[PDB]
Design a protein around this nucleic acid. Structure first.
Ligand code: MG
Ligand code: MG
Ligand code: MG
Ligand code: MG
Ligand code: MG
Ligand code: MG
Ligand code: MG
Ligand code: MG
Ligand code: MG
Ligand code: MG
Ligand code: MG
Ligand code: MG
Ligand code: MG
Ligand code: MG
Ligand code: MG
Ligand code: MG
Ligand code: MG
Ligand code: MG
Ligand code: MG
Ligand code: MG
Ligand code: MG
Ligand code: MG
Ligand code: MG
Ligand code: MG
Ligand code: MG
Ligand code: MG
Ligand code: MG
Ligand code: MG
Ligand code: MG
Ligand code: MG
Ligand code: MG
Ligand code: MG
Ligand code: MG
Ligand code: MG
Ligand code: MG
Ligand code: MG
Ligand code: MG
Ligand code: MG
Ligand code: MG
Ligand code: MG
Ligand code: MG
Ligand code: MG
Ligand code: MG
Ligand code: MG
Ligand code: MG
Ligand code: MG
Ligand code: MG
Ligand code: MG
Ligand code: MG
Ligand code: MG
Ligand code: MG
Ligand code: MG
Ligand code: MG
Ligand code: MG
Ligand code: MG
Ligand code: MG
Ligand code: MG
Ligand code: MG
Ligand code: MG
Ligand code: MG
Ligand code: MG
Ligand code: MG
Ligand code: MG
Ligand code: MG
Ligand code: MG
Ligand code: MG
Ligand code: MG
Ligand code: MG
Ligand code: MG
Ligand code: MG
Ligand code: MG
Ligand code: MG
Ligand code: MG
Ligand code: MG
Ligand code: MG
Ligand code: MG
Ligand code: MG
Ligand code: MG
Ligand code: MG
Ligand code: MG
Ligand code: MG
Ligand code: MG
Ligand code: MG
Ligand code: MG
Ligand code: MG
Ligand code: MG
Ligand code: MG
Ligand code: MG
Ligand code: MG
Ligand code: MG
Ligand code: MG
Ligand code: MG
Ligand code: MG
Ligand code: MG
Ligand code: MG
Ligand code: MG
Ligand code: MG
Ligand code: MG
Ligand code: MG
Ligand code: MG
Ligand code: MG
Ligand code: MG
Ligand code: MG
Ligand code: MG
Ligand code: MG
Ligand code: MG
Ligand code: MG
Ligand code: MG
Ligand code: MG
Ligand code: MG
Ligand code: MG
Ligand code: MG
Ligand code: MG
Ligand code: MG
Ligand code: MG
Ligand code: MG
Ligand code: MG
Ligand code: MG
Ligand code: MG
Ligand code: MG
Ligand code: MG
Ligand code: MG
Ligand code: MG
Ligand code: MG
Ligand code: MG
Ligand code: MG
Ligand code: MG
Ligand code: MG
Ligand code: MG
Ligand code: MG
Ligand code: MG
Ligand code: MG
Ligand code: MG
Ligand code: MG
Ligand code: MG
Ligand code: MG
Ligand code: MG
Ligand code: MG
Ligand code: MG
Ligand code: MG
Ligand code: MG
Ligand code: MG
Ligand code: MG
Ligand code: MG
Ligand code: MG
Ligand code: MG
Ligand code: MG
Ligand code: MG
Ligand code: MG
Ligand code: MG
Ligand code: MG
Ligand code: MG
Ligand code: MG
Ligand code: MG
Ligand code: MG
Ligand code: MG
Ligand code: MG
Ligand code: MG
Ligand code: MG
Ligand code: MG
Ligand code: MG
Ligand code: MG
Ligand code: MG
Ligand code: MG
Ligand code: MG
Ligand code: MG
Ligand code: MG
Ligand code: MG
Ligand code: MG
Ligand code: MG
Ligand code: MG
Ligand code: MG
Ligand code: MG
Ligand code: MG
Ligand code: MG
Ligand code: MG
Ligand code: MG
Ligand code: MG
Ligand code: MG
Ligand code: MG
Ligand code: MG
Ligand code: MG
Ligand code: MG
Ligand code: MG
Ligand code: MG
Ligand code: MG
Ligand code: MG
Ligand code: MG
Ligand code: MG
Ligand code: MG
Ligand code: MG
Ligand code: MG
Ligand code: MG
Ligand code: MG
Ligand code: MG
Ligand code: MG
Ligand code: MG
Ligand code: MG
Ligand code: MG
Ligand code: MG
Ligand code: MG
Ligand code: MG
Ligand code: MG
Ligand code: MG
Ligand code: MG
Ligand code: MG
Ligand code: MG
Ligand code: MG
Ligand code: MG
Ligand code: MG
Ligand code: MG
Ligand code: MG
Ligand code: MG
Ligand code: MG
Ligand code: MG
Ligand code: MG
Ligand code: MG
Ligand code: MG
Ligand code: MG
Ligand code: MG
Ligand code: MG
Ligand code: MG
Ligand code: MG
Ligand code: MG
Ligand code: MG
Ligand code: MG
Ligand code: MG
Ligand code: MG
Ligand code: MG
Ligand code: MG
Ligand code: MG
Ligand code: MG
Ligand code: MG
Ligand code: MG
Ligand code: MG
Ligand code: MG
Ligand code: MG
Ligand code: MG
Ligand code: MG
Ligand code: MG
Ligand code: MG
Ligand code: MG
Ligand code: MG
Ligand code: MG
Ligand code: MG
Ligand code: MG
Ligand code: MG
Ligand code: MG
Ligand code: MG
Ligand code: MG
Ligand code: MG
Ligand code: MG
Ligand code: MG
Ligand code: MG
Ligand code: MG
Ligand code: MG
Ligand code: MG
Ligand code: MG
Ligand code: MG
Ligand code: MG
Ligand code: MG
Ligand code: MG
Ligand code: MG
Ligand code: MG
Ligand code: MG
Ligand code: MG
Ligand code: MG
Ligand code: MG
Ligand code: MG
Ligand code: MG
Ligand code: MG
Ligand code: MG
Ligand code: MG
Ligand code: MG
Ligand code: MG
Ligand code: MG
Ligand code: MG
Ligand code: MG
Ligand code: MG
Ligand code: MG
Ligand code: MG
Ligand code: MG
Ligand code: MG
Ligand code: MG
Ligand code: MG
Ligand code: MG
Ligand code: MG
Ligand code: MG
Ligand code: MG
Ligand code: MG
Ligand code: MG
Ligand code: MG
Lengths: 73, 97
RNA sequence: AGCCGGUAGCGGGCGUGGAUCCCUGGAUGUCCGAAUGGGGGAACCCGGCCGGCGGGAACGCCGGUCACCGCGCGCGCGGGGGGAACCUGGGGAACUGAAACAUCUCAGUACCCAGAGGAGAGGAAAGAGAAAUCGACUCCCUGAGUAGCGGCGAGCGA
RNA sequence: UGGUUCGUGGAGCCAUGGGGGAAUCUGGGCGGACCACCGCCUAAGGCUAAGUACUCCGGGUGACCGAUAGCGCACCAGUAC
RNA sequence: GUAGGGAAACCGAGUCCGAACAGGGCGCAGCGGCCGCAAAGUCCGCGGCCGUGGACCCGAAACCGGGCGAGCUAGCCCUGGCCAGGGUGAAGCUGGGGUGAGACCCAGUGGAGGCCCGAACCGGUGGGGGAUGCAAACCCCUCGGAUGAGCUGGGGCUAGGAGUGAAAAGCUAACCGAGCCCGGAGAUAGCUGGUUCUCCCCGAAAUGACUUUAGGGUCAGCCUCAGGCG
RNA sequence: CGUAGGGUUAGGCGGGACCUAAGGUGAAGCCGAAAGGCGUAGCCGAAGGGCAGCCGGUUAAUAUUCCGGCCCUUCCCGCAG
RNA sequence: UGGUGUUGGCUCUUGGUCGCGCCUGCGUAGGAUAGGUGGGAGCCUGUGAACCCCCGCCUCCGGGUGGGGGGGAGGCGCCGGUGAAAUACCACCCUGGCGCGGCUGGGGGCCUAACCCUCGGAUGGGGGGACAGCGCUUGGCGGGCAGUUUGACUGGGCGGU
RNA sequence: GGGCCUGACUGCGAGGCCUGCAAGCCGAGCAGGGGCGAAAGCCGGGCCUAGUGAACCGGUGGUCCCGUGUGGAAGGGCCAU
C-alpha cells in the first residue's frame, strides 16, 4: 500500500515522501501511532495543496525580496 | 462465523463432489462421482480494531474488505465524534454508507 | 304494531307520545393474553410518583402514568404479536423410482424460520439471439415433451 | 460451489465462500472454452399500479349428499370420553 | 397430414452404401354415367387396452421433518425426615506386670463397624394357590440388607441415533436391539384375502428360449374378437 | 347416587406483601443461517431460614379462626428522657 | 498435514530470478593462454613508459590480472607468420566466480505491533508471539458413525455346478 | 514332397438354414482390383462342429459430415479398430 511518510524515519526516506509498504505493518505499527497515512485520492489533493501552499508563500517571499532588491542598490 | 459487518458476507450453502477415475480429456474413461457432501462455506473473518475518538472500536469484517473500514474512518473526520460511547461510535461509522 | 333472546312459567312493567328489531357512530369496556411499572404456574400476588374518599398518618379503595428496541433534535415518532390457504426469501429429508443400490429420484416436496401485502415476488436491460430483427415485469395458450441433459438407465426438461 | 436443459463435460452465461485485482466511453460485459472480426446492452443503490394465486368470509348456482351419506359437528362438537 | 432417403451435409420419388449407370436396403401410383358415390386424411363423442398419476380395493416391519414427555423408571443436584429393640466389644484411658527403658500382656473403664440377631423399612430366594384372578404382576408361609454403597419426602437437571445405565442392549408413562403425537403419505408390499343383478356364445395353458430367474416379469405356442382371402 | 337450602370467620396456624438452594431466567456482554444457545452482577426459586398464642366453651355442622379469661407482635401519631 | 489469508520488523544464512562493478575461459597451426556477432587502419604515457622487485588472485605448470615501488617516456597492431577464426583499443552478451545492488526462497536468531491469556488496577503492565486460534484449497488417517450390498441352482447348509 | 503366391480380398449379394428376439450357420453370383494353371478352372483362410461377449465409455488411425451470427477452433459424427 502507498502511504505518505509523516515523520522522517530510518532506512525509509524523506518526510512527505510517498512509500509503499506491506499494509499489515502500517495497520499494526505505523497508522495507530500517527506516523503514517495511506495515500488516497484526497490526500494527494491535500499534499499537492500544502506543497503548493509552501510554494504560494515561497513565490511571494522571494519575489518581494527581489522587488525590494530592485529598490535598493 | 457470524455475518460480516460492512458488506454483510455470511456463510453459504455448498457441496463437495468426490470424484474418481481418469478423465476423458487426458484419454481415460471419465470422471465419476463417488459421493456428495453438503457443507457451509464460512467467510474469512477477523477482528479489526480501530481506535477512533479516543475509544477502542471492534469490527468483524472479511480480510479482503479491510481497507474499506479505514476508508470509512478516514472519511468520517467531518463529524464530531467525541463524547459518544464506542457503541454509538460503531453505529455512526456505518452512517457514511 | 307488539315486545322484553333461548324461554313456557312464578312473578312484573313497556309500546302510534313509533316500544321490540336492523345499520351506523360514540360512550363504556373487570381480568388474562404481544402484556407492558413489577414478579409469575393465564384470568394471580405486589409496589414508584402524582390527583382524590373514610376521621385517615399507621390501612384500604379510586384517578393517570410508570417495561424493551430503533430512529429524529428527557421529550416525540414508531417498532413486537395475529390470521384459512395463497407470496418471497433464508434453511431443507425420506419412503420410494431406478423392480436392488452409492452418481441419479421422490425434490426445493413435506416440514423449519423470517418477514410482506391485501397481494407477494418481479420489474424499464452489461436482456434475448442471428433473425438486415425484437425492445419493461407478471399471467394464459403454444413452442414440445422439440431443443437438450442423463450409472445417455430410470426418469427429467428448457 | 450452486441456478440454467446440462450429473464435468469443448462448459459458456447469472450469484459467490477463498487469495489477488483493475479501468471511465478511446470505457466495460454478452453473443456458449478460445482468437480475429461483426452485431446487442451499460453492471457494482433502489423504487413501480395494471394482467395472476389463493379462502376465515357474504352471496348466487348445481344430472353434488339426503343423518354409517354431506365436513371431526344438520342435535350445546373439537364437546363426551 | 399430404414425400422420402441418408449420421450429416445434401439430394429427392427417389435415396444410402458403393468406383459402378453392380446388386440390395429403405420409400413412390378408387367405382359408375366435369358430377353422384366412395376413400387415403382430419375432428368430436362413445367403449377396449396401455402410459403418468395413489390407478381395483384392505394391510405392515419400518425410513426420515417438526413438536410432547424424567409425576414411571435410571442416574445425579438442592433442601428435609427416618431406621423398635438385643447381641459382640477395635482403638483410647486408669489400675498392674515387663525391660536398663520399650515392644507386649491380663482386669476395670471405655464404645469402633460398607459387624451379627432381628421388627417398621427395601426386597423377590423356594414352593402353594392365583391364570376371563383381588390385581395387565396379587395372597400366604419361608427367605437376604436392615447406621449404610441406607430408607424415602419435596424442589430440580439430564432424551430419540439421544439420555441414563454398580451392564440386562436394561428402562425413559404397563409391549424400547431404537420412545409417544402430528405431518411428507393414500410410503411401499412381485405378498394374504375379498372383489356384489341375469340369460345366450367359444374355450386355454401349467410348455420352449432367456431373465440376481425359480411361488414374479418379455416373447413364442395354446383362446377369443371385427375385416378380408376361399 | 337423585333435590333445594344451609355450612369453611385468623395481626397469632400454614402462605404471599421477607431472605436465600439447586435451578429458572437474566442489565454488561459472548456465541449462532433463522428459531435461538450462553452469561460473574441482578431478579426468581421452600417442607430450608427468619416470624409474633396457650387453653376452654360452643353449634346440624367451623373454630388456637367467633366468645371467654389470660399472654403477645408490627406500624403510625402523642409525650418524656 | 502442506499452501495461502488474519500477518509484521530486524539480522544471519545460502538459493532462484534481474541492474551493475566485475575477473575467469590454454587442441594443429599461430609472439602470449585465440570467447562469438558486429565495428577496425591507429591506440597509451605529468588519469608517468620499457623494465624491476615486495603480496593477492585464476593457475592446462607456462602464465593471466590487479597492482605497488623505482626507473620515468618507451612499447604492442593492421602488414606477415598463421590457422577455420589474429592479436592493440572502443560496443552487444556469453562459461564460470566473486564484490554491490532490484526482486525474491527458505530456514537460524532478535524485536513487538496484529492475535490469545492474565493482572482490585484495562489507551496500562506482563507472558506467549508472528506461533497458535480462525477462512478456503490440497492429500492422508478415518466402523467413531451413515447409507447400502453381500448371486441363483439345490430331492437349507457344505461341497459341487 | 516341393514351386509361385496373398482371395486369412474391397464394394456387394439371389435365396435359404436356424429361429421367440437378438442372434449363429450356408451361399452361387455381379463389379473393381488380384493369385495361379497350358487350360478348364480354382482362392472371401484352416476337413467340419468348441478356441467366445451384447449395449453403455473412451482411445488410437483415417475420413473431411457437422461447426450455436460469422472464419477458424474445441468437440462430436462416419469408417475401420
Ligand atoms: Mg528501507
Ligand atoms: Mg501521544
Ligand atoms: Mg536570502
Ligand atoms: Mg551593500
Ligand atoms: Mg461456527
Ligand atoms: Mg449477499
Ligand atoms: Mg446464496
Ligand atoms: Mg444438491
Ligand atoms: Mg472437504
Ligand atoms: Mg472437488
Ligand atoms: Mg477430493
Ligand atoms: Mg481428482
Ligand atoms: Mg484418485
Ligand atoms: Mg483406486
Ligand atoms: Mg482399471
Ligand atoms: Mg480435474
Ligand atoms: Mg485428444
Ligand atoms: Mg483443468
Ligand atoms: Mg497417465
Ligand atoms: Mg448423499
Ligand atoms: Mg458438513
Ligand atoms: Mg475512558
Ligand atoms: Mg479491549
Ligand atoms: Mg468481537
Ligand atoms: Mg452516557
Ligand atoms: Mg454519501
Ligand atoms: Mg320476563
Ligand atoms: Mg314473558
Ligand atoms: Mg325468561
Ligand atoms: Mg315450550
Ligand atoms: Mg303447556
Ligand atoms: Mg310449564
Ligand atoms: Mg298460562
Ligand atoms: Mg300495561
Ligand atoms: Mg390490577
Ligand atoms: Mg396491566
Ligand atoms: Mg398498574
Ligand atoms: Mg411461584
Ligand atoms: Mg416484590
Ligand atoms: Mg392494587
Ligand atoms: Mg421516578
Ligand atoms: Mg374523587
Ligand atoms: Mg367513598
Ligand atoms: Mg389503578
Ligand atoms: Mg393502586
Ligand atoms: Mg425478554
Ligand atoms: Mg442489542
Ligand atoms: Mg435484533
Ligand atoms: Mg428530531
Ligand atoms: Mg440539547
Ligand atoms: Mg437529558
Ligand atoms: Mg422525572
Ligand atoms: Mg426541545
Ligand atoms: Mg405529537
Ligand atoms: Mg413537543
Ligand atoms: Mg420524528
Ligand atoms: Mg424485531
Ligand atoms: Mg423475535
Ligand atoms: Mg407468525
Ligand atoms: Mg417457491
Ligand atoms: Mg439430519
Ligand atoms: Mg416419478
Ligand atoms: Mg419390488
Ligand atoms: Mg410425485
Ligand atoms: Mg434439491
Ligand atoms: Mg412434478
Ligand atoms: Mg418453500
Ligand atoms: Mg403437493
Ligand atoms: Mg436445523
Ligand atoms: Mg428476525
Ligand atoms: Mg424487519
Ligand atoms: Mg408480522
Ligand atoms: Mg382489490
Ligand atoms: Mg403489486
Ligand atoms: Mg423464482
Ligand atoms: Mg437498415
Ligand atoms: Mg432498431
Ligand atoms: Mg413497447
Ligand atoms: Mg386457465
Ligand atoms: Mg409459456
Ligand atoms: Mg430438476
Ligand atoms: Mg437464486
Ligand atoms: Mg442436477
Ligand atoms: Mg472446472
Ligand atoms: Mg458448471
Ligand atoms: Mg441475491
Ligand atoms: Mg462478491
Ligand atoms: Mg485462496
Ligand atoms: Mg491480481
Ligand atoms: Mg460503444
Ligand atoms: Mg485499443
Ligand atoms: Mg478452461
Ligand atoms: Mg437496482
Ligand atoms: Mg397496492
Ligand atoms: Mg398454485
Ligand atoms: Mg387453479
Ligand atoms: Mg378465485
Ligand atoms: Mg374451505
Ligand atoms: Mg374457523
Ligand atoms: Mg368477516
Ligand atoms: Mg363460503
Ligand atoms: Mg354479517
Ligand atoms: Mg343474510
Ligand atoms: Mg352478489
Ligand atoms: Mg343480498
Ligand atoms: Mg348456500
Ligand atoms: Mg340475484
Ligand atoms: Mg336451487
Ligand atoms: Mg335413519
Ligand atoms: Mg375445514
Ligand atoms: Mg365451514
Ligand atoms: Mg333437543
Ligand atoms: Mg338449535
Ligand atoms: Mg361445533
Ligand atoms: Mg362450537
Ligand atoms: Mg467409373
Ligand atoms: Mg469419392
Ligand atoms: Mg464403365
Ligand atoms: Mg442404381
Ligand atoms: Mg456391383
Ligand atoms: Mg453395367
Ligand atoms: Mg436397377
Ligand atoms: Mg400417375
Ligand atoms: Mg402422384
Ligand atoms: Mg352413354
Ligand atoms: Mg369432363
Ligand atoms: Mg369407413
Ligand atoms: Mg395409399
Ligand atoms: Mg384421391
Ligand atoms: Mg370417458
Ligand atoms: Mg395393445
Ligand atoms: Mg381405460
Ligand atoms: Mg395404468
Ligand atoms: Mg416403533
Ligand atoms: Mg424421528
Ligand atoms: Mg431432529
Ligand atoms: Mg423432536
Ligand atoms: Mg422439555
Ligand atoms: Mg423416585
Ligand atoms: Mg444434577
Ligand atoms: Mg441433613
Ligand atoms: Mg434427599
Ligand atoms: Mg421431615
Ligand atoms: Mg439398635
Ligand atoms: Mg436399649
Ligand atoms: Mg445398644
Ligand atoms: Mg447372638
Ligand atoms: Mg455389655
Ligand atoms: Mg484404688
Ligand atoms: Mg501391689
Ligand atoms: Mg470412674
Ligand atoms: Mg458399659
Ligand atoms: Mg434370634
Ligand atoms: Mg412412623
Ligand atoms: Mg412405606
Ligand atoms: Mg416376583
Ligand atoms: Mg415387588
Ligand atoms: Mg409371592
Ligand atoms: Mg417364586
Ligand atoms: Mg408359584
Ligand atoms: Mg390361598
Ligand atoms: Mg384367592
Ligand atoms: Mg404383557
Ligand atoms: Mg390371612
Ligand atoms: Mg406353613
Ligand atoms: Mg413373617
Ligand atoms: Mg406355623
Ligand atoms: Mg415356622
Ligand atoms: Mg425378614
Ligand atoms: Mg444379600
Ligand atoms: Mg444394604
Ligand atoms: Mg446407590
Ligand atoms: Mg449417605
Ligand atoms: Mg426425591
Ligand atoms: Mg424442599
Ligand atoms: Mg410441596
Ligand atoms: Mg420431584
Ligand atoms: Mg421442573
Ligand atoms: Mg436435543
Ligand atoms: Mg429438551
Ligand atoms: Mg444430537
Ligand atoms: Mg408403550
Ligand atoms: Mg412379550
Ligand atoms: Mg417384540
Ligand atoms: Mg395392550
Ligand atoms: Mg431351442
Ligand atoms: Mg403374452
Ligand atoms: Mg400346445
Ligand atoms: Mg395341436
Ligand atoms: Mg347428597
Ligand atoms: Mg386487630
Ligand atoms: Mg392451618
Ligand atoms: Mg408451627
Ligand atoms: Mg404449636
Ligand atoms: Mg401451607
Ligand atoms: Mg405456594
Ligand atoms: Mg414480614
Ligand atoms: Mg424489611
Ligand atoms: Mg420474593
Ligand atoms: Mg446452597
Ligand atoms: Mg446459575
Ligand atoms: Mg426446563
Ligand atoms: Mg438461557
Ligand atoms: Mg439476551
Ligand atoms: Mg439496565
Ligand atoms: Mg434484570
Ligand atoms: Mg431491565
Ligand atoms: Mg438493552
Ligand atoms: Mg463494560
Ligand atoms: Mg462476553
Ligand atoms: Mg472472545
Ligand atoms: Mg435473516
Ligand atoms: Mg427451533
Ligand atoms: Mg427448530
Ligand atoms: Mg432469549
Ligand atoms: Mg439473531
Ligand atoms: Mg441471548
Ligand atoms: Mg461486571
Ligand atoms: Mg424452578
Ligand atoms: Mg414435613
Ligand atoms: Mg408444614
Ligand atoms: Mg406448600
Ligand atoms: Mg420454618
Ligand atoms: Mg408471615
Ligand atoms: Mg418475645
Ligand atoms: Mg363439653
Ligand atoms: Mg357437641
Ligand atoms: Mg365435633
Ligand atoms: Mg379448640
Ligand atoms: Mg361464637
Ligand atoms: Mg358466627
Ligand atoms: Mg406491650
Ligand atoms: Mg410482622
Ligand atoms: Mg410493616
Ligand atoms: Mg492454494
Ligand atoms: Mg595443448
Ligand atoms: Mg546469434
Ligand atoms: Mg562467423
Ligand atoms: Mg585500410
Ligand atoms: Mg604505423
Ligand atoms: Mg598439453
Ligand atoms: Mg613437473
Ligand atoms: Mg553472483
Ligand atoms: Mg528501490
Ligand atoms: Mg522463521
Ligand atoms: Mg525460530
Ligand atoms: Mg524470538
Ligand atoms: Mg530492534
Ligand atoms: Mg522477550
Ligand atoms: Mg536492542
Ligand atoms: Mg476463547
Ligand atoms: Mg473490566
Ligand atoms: Mg490493550
Ligand atoms: Mg508502568
Ligand atoms: Mg517461536
Ligand atoms: Mg491458544
Ligand atoms: Mg477469535
Ligand atoms: Mg483450518
Ligand atoms: Mg481442490
Ligand atoms: Mg496420494
Ligand atoms: Mg481431503
Ligand atoms: Mg479423502
Ligand atoms: Mg481413502
Ligand atoms: Mg498416525
Ligand atoms: Mg457398519
Ligand atoms: Mg473403510
Ligand atoms: Mg455421520
Ligand atoms: Mg458421533
Ligand atoms: Mg446424511
Ligand atoms: Mg451417504
Ligand atoms: Mg451382487
Ligand atoms: Mg441363496
Ligand atoms: Mg425348489
Ligand atoms: Mg431337500
Ligand atoms: Mg426340488
Ligand atoms: Mg438337498
Ligand atoms: Mg439338513
Ligand atoms: Mg453349516
Ligand atoms: Mg442357517
Ligand atoms: Mg452362513
Ligand atoms: Mg453355495
Ligand atoms: Mg468332503
Ligand atoms: Mg466351483
Ligand atoms: Mg470399404
Ligand atoms: Mg434378382
Ligand atoms: Mg421363409
Ligand atoms: Mg440360432
Ligand atoms: Mg415364427
Ligand atoms: Mg483423433
Ligand atoms: Mg481450414
Ligand atoms: Mg477431429
Ligand atoms: Mg474421437
Amino acid at each position: 500500500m502507498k502511504v505518505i511518510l509523516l515523520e522522517p524515519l530510518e532506512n525509509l526516506g524523506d518526510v512527505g515522501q510517498v512509500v509503499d509498504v506491506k499494509p499489515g505493518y502500517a495497520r499494526n505499527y505505523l497508522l495507530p501511532r500517527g506516523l503514517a497515512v495511506l495515500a488516497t485520492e484526497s490526500n494527494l489533493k491535500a499534499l499537492e495543496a500544502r506543497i503548493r501552499a509552501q510554494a504560494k508563500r515561497l513565490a511571494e517571499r522571494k519575489a518581494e525580496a527581489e522587488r525590494l532588491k530592485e529598490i535598493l542598490e | 462465523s457470524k455475518v460480516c459487518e460492512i458488506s454483510g458476507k455470511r456463510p453459504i450453502v455448498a457441496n463437495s463432489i468426490q470424484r474418481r477415475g481418469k478423465a476423458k480429456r487426458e484419454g481415460g474413461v471419465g470422471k465419476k462421482t463417488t459421493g456428495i457432501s453438503k457443507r457451509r462455506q464460512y467467510p474469512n473473518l477477523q477482528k479489526v480494531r480501530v481506535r477512533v475518538a479516543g475509544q477502542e472500536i471492534t469490527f468483524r469484517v472479511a480480510a479482503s474488505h479491510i481497507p474499506k473500514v479505514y476508508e470509512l474512518v478516514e472519511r468520517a473526520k467531518g463529524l464530531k465524534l467525541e463524547g459518544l460511547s464506542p457503541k454509538e461510535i460503531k453505529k455512526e461509522l456505518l452512517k457514511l454508507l
